[PDB]
Design a binder for this molecule. Structure first.
Ligand SMILES: OC[C@H]1O[C@@H](O)[C@@H](O)[C@@H](O)[C@@H]1O
Ligand SMILES: OC[C@H]1O[C@@H](O)[C@@H](O)[C@@H](O)[C@@H]1O
Ligand SMILES: [Ca+2]
Ligand SMILES: [Ca+2]
Lengths: 693, 681
């Protein structure tokens, strides 16, 4: 059985607003596809519209939802029914299905509707899908179509529909129109509207249908149609997946279960989503939603760079460099359309944060020589974005004036500590890119500004705390207090948010020993939290509090790098134990998969890096900290060198939580430099029962 | 570890409107208690307010909800919080909790609120509960109170509150008022209202609190308070449970897992719920909701007799005869208050069905000599209580009435119950008239198709028929199941279908068919359809009452050995010792009793006939206390292999039997089944 068929897209999909096990969806699609496909369980639960445990479905939803917090857009629900019987609404047409016989694979979705006795099969392409419908008793099929957008349907010929649907983007309120073409191999006997939805009656009890969408035009949607039969489309999708999955090759698992790792590989290649199309002459084009006009060039959607810069993109840099460059070209195209580097695309700008963490991808690209052709423009785009004011109020740095004046955002701004620290990291990214381009004045100014994390450190308590305009800390402080000054965490986590200058953070805290004790205390504390900053409990609090990892809130991005900070401490062996145990206890090969929000490849990439044995602690520095690998023998394709790295784990016992030694080829290492990594053939960890350093 | 502590009240509690795994709640209570206690997960999901998988809770709900279809009434949510912080609504006060460390036992509920660092413990009494709250950091406690009813709070002294809450009953719209007394061992610093709820501030970071309710009066609520400390109340609740659970004693499980059976025992003793109280002079009193005045005598709520007559009550008759009589006295008291024998009590009449299946309990009591002192009054109540015009005129309900086939068949059974009770009281004219009427199931049989079908006023069947069609003429099933709803005259049903062979083929076809259904009668899919359709049992829809007896019908067929295989495999495949426990709605002891009977090896196919059909038992050696004879029956299963699906022979003491008569059962010491690999008959 090939790997792709063993991956279950339902991992992470059991969630509610109050508690996340991944907040993923069972996305069927090609890697980075423009549309994904998922069954819809309910439309009464807002963004939480799929439940893998409930054997009910309402149809297949063509979706663009990247998270339940962002929600969906330009989505379309397709519901096969028998022409006879049925019901008078979407809800009253819902059907039980056979969960055990359903297939939930990345490239293949199969469901059997027990009410209608219809077998539905779907396989994706980038811009569309091939779908087979079969009423097993030979009764005629009909198809319902529903959207939250205003949906219009025209019959073009005996076997072809053209759909148009319209809504608005959530934050910019730009008009957003998606066109869809559907073509069947059986005649369409009638179309009509029923209570806002469309009902298409078909001549046969069986049909194969081609579907495709476009954000360009109706004729582009037709062009985007699959040209091949179901099996051929399915094989192509399999090949598209396999091309990327096979950049990792597990030679020997040892004691480890590979199931979770495999699932993470699937999650790694879903985002960002393609948001450009190819015209008749073979050129990339995209809709500029600010003007409603077509512009040349690649473009992508569905990514919050604050999530993905820290784990996902660095991993892309190792294994899919062409894709990596294409993504950066797309983000540069966003800049060319709007004047600003984007923050959270879905499909246009949705970011409410002031921080611009795409800079972390830009700086990382620079330090690893990924996109030399774009380096100049990207730098200029960062600089523009960091200094320019937006008359429309949406983009660039907020409180720039105050930040420039004071060296920090004050309590005039919400979540001022978290955002000040994000700015300080961005400043480092600009400084590094300036330096590499030999712009000395800019490098010097931004390097100095990147030290602004110092402005908020309260040496009396030992934590980062917020200041008012006059520069005073607020008198009532608790390190367990969440929100207000800190985004989805407390001072305990937020204080360690200085990726770009860990040595300086150490000096700032009073030196290596005090820093060491800070880390230990975070690991040893109970997962206490206070709701003061919010006035209610949010899922991120609940996820930490119900877990046995102290204040290491692995459920959310701010704690991702914390275990690796022991590498800079008096106890460098503690990183391995923390990682081995987190990996074993926090992640499960089941529908209740993750410790928190997966966040578009962010958390899966965290897991994968854990398995490789090293981690890009500070994107923008060409360096990796050591953790502890998972498998006896795993190969990873270092695509930039067109060669395999063999990663070996010796004495790989489950009760050995420490690394005795690590050799890059023949050389003993405690940190790995990117250049050395790329020159290496072998990476060999030897484990031990007790610490040896 | 005692049995009671191994029972997890969450079995059956994972559900949604569209799909049931029991539709139970994690009820903490004493057996047949007046109030039960459950954590509340959400108030945005209607009746589906608890989810065992979600580590969130909004407080402890004092509930009277017997099913999500009926909903709740006279309920009260109690929410411990820290006096500092908190939030501005019930929703914004919800807290995560530690699911793994929580206890969900019948007599003991423990949850740790992680947001407030408060450990809550509750143990029930019949009329109240003892509660311990402990803020583990020594921060002061407050307590919120919420209800859908209009809720009023008065502070009686430093440590005592008197609560009053009012609503109306769902169908009759009778006024419904519950009083609650709360007493703490720490001072109440303040009470106030916030956005419709009450906030009680307490002096300490921990307290033990006594709670009790009444439907009589505020002073009766105070009288109902627990008089003892937490441990003592907990021991008493344990003893109350053990007294009933120990009527079954598993000596040797063999290959079988006992976990599900044990859970079913817990479910057996929850309903009906006590709905009467004891005055200062020791007499039973109840609120008559039709008048708003107090009346003497026991009274019970939360039971739909259409569910419970067929399995639960017959089982009660064997093991808890005093309780059995008390329940019947309560139902007679309902008749005395309203003029009608009740159908679905929650807490007053909710039944939409025309059928009066409490007659099945009355007739069964008669045939087993359970309540000789009530026999005359019960008979009179049945006759009084006994649509009607047309039924009397035509011998059936026509399509003028919804679900006419199901209801006609229910009436025919009720007529048999009256006829049997008449005969036993030597009222010959009534016995004769109702015996004849009990044959009315024949009026709807269509010999062309072989199914029961509906008729219009003129007596015609509707021309377009499908046996897979659900609703309209049939309640929550198709003609395939509904046609077999003639408990009281199986031999006649057989003759009516064309004889033993044709009947046999009917049964086989039901077992062999795909679980196809058509939504025609509803216009949408309902959970009962979904449960059948997703299961591998053909048209044997074990998820719902109409199919419960179908496997046992093979006992009357050319293939009497097939019953055992159907039961053994249903029992193994349809029930799971987990939160996703049941194939369908548990229905207040109805489905659990079905399971328990399966385990004993015999079944009360027709309540009102003093007779049990044979199935196939579960354990190597199980004892059951036949309380009427004050002795144990030892049930043995020989060659009890999991791949042996048939009964080679069954001996009641020394006598070979194929059906068991109640009288013989009560005289017996031993019941011995020997299993076989292949059929032997
Ligand atoms: O209100 C804070 C919330 O913000 C949402 O957009 C998401 O980030 C949630 O994960 C988080 O709980
Ligand atoms: O309308 C049918 C529905 O009616 C409710 O009262 C319950 O009996 C459900 O089990 C059922 O699905
Ligand atoms: Ca997150
Ligand atoms: Ca039922």
């Amino acid at each position: 059985k090939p790997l792709l068929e063993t991956i279950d897209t339902r991992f992470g999909t059991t969630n509610k607003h109050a508690f996340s096990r991944g907040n993923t969806l069972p996305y069927t699609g090609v890697p980075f596809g423009m549309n994904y496909f998922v069954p819809q369980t309910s439309d009464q639960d807002g963004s939480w519209f799929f439940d893998p445990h409930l054997p009910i479905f309402q149809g297949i939803r063509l979706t663009h939802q990247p998270s339940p917090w962002i929600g969906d857009y330009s989505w379309l629900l397709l519901t096969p029914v028998t022409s006879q019987l049925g019901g008078d609404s979407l809800f009253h047409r819902q059907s039980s299905y056979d969960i055990d016989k359903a297939c939930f694979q990345p490239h293949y979705l199969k469901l059997f509707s027990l009410r209608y006795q219809i077998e539905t099969q779907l396989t994706p392409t980038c811009y569309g899908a091939s779908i087979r419908l079969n009423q097993k008793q030979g009764k005629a099929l009909s198809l319902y179509l529903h959207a939250a957008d205003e949906l219009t349907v025209e019959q073009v010929d005996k076997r072809t529909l053209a759909l148009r649907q319209e809504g608005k983007t959530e934050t910019n309120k730009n008009s957003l129109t998606m066109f869809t073409a559907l073509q069947m191999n059986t005649d369409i006997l009638a179309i009509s509207q029923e209570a806002g939805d469309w009902r298409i009656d078909l001549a046969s009890s069986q049909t194969e249908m081609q579907l495709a969408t476009s954000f360009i035009s109706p004729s582009q949607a037709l062009i985007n149609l699959p040209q091949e039969d179901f099996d051929s489309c399915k094989s192509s999708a399999q090949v598209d997946w396999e091309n990327l999955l096979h950049r990792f090759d597990i030679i020997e698992t040892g004691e480890a279960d590979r199931t979770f790792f495999d699932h993470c590989l699937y999650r790694l290649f879903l985002f960002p989503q393609t948001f450009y199309e190819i015209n008749e002459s073979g050129q990339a084009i995209h809709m500029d939603l600010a003007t409603g006009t077509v512009k040349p060039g690649v473009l992508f959607s569905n990514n919050g760079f604050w999530d993905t810069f820290r784990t996902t993109f660095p991993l892309f840099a190792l294994i899919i460099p062409e894709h990596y460059q294409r993504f950066l070209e797309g983000f540069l195209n966003s800049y060319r359309d709007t004047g600003f580097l984007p923050k959270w695309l879905a499909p246009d700008e949705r970011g409410m944060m002031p921080g611009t963490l795409l800079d972390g991808i830009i700086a990382d690209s620079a330090c690893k020589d990924m996109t030399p052709d774009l380096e100049g423009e990207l730098f200029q785009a960062m600089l523009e974005t960091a200094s320019k004011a937006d008359p429309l109020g949406i983009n660039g740095r907020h409180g720039l004036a105050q930040y420039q004046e004071l060296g920090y955002l004050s309590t005039d701004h919400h979540e001022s500590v978290s955002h000040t620290l994000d700015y300080a990291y961005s400043d480092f990214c600009i400084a590094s890119c300036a330096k590499k381009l030999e712009n000395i004045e800019i490098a010097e100014t931004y390097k100095a500004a990147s030290q602004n994390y110092r402005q908020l450190f309260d040496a009396e308590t030992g934590y980062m705390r917020a200041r008012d305009n006059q520069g005073n800390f607020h008198p009532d402080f608790s390190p367990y207090s969440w929100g207000r000054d800190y985004a989805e965490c407390s001072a305990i986590q937020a204080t360690l948010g200085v990726l770009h200058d860990i040595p300086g953070l150490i000096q700032l805290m009073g030196g290596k020993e005090t820093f060491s004790n800070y880390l230990l205390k975070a690991c040893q504390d109970a997962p206490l939290f206070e709701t003061t900053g919010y006035g209610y409990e949010i899922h991120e609090m609940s996820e930490m509090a119900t877990a046995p990892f102290g204040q290491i809130a692995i459920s959310n991005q701010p704690s991702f790098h914390i275990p690796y900070l022991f590498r800079y401490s008096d106890y460098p062996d503690y990183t391995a134990l923390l990682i081995k145990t987190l990996r074993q206890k926090a992640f499960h090969p089941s529908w209740e998969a993750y410790p928190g929000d997966e966040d578009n490849g962010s958390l899966s990439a965290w897991y994968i890096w854990s398995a490789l044995g090293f981690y890009p602690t500070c994107p923008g520095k060409p360096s990796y900290d050591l953790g502890i690998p998972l498998f006896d023998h795993l190969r990873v394709y270092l695509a930039k060198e067109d060669k395999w790295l063999d990663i070996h784990t010796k004495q790989n016992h489950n009760h050995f939580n420490f690394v005795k030694e690590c050799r890059l080829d023949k050389t003993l290492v405690s940190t790995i430099q990117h250049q050395d990594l790329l020159k290496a053939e072998q990476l060999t960890f030897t484990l031990s029962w007790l610490p040896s350093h």
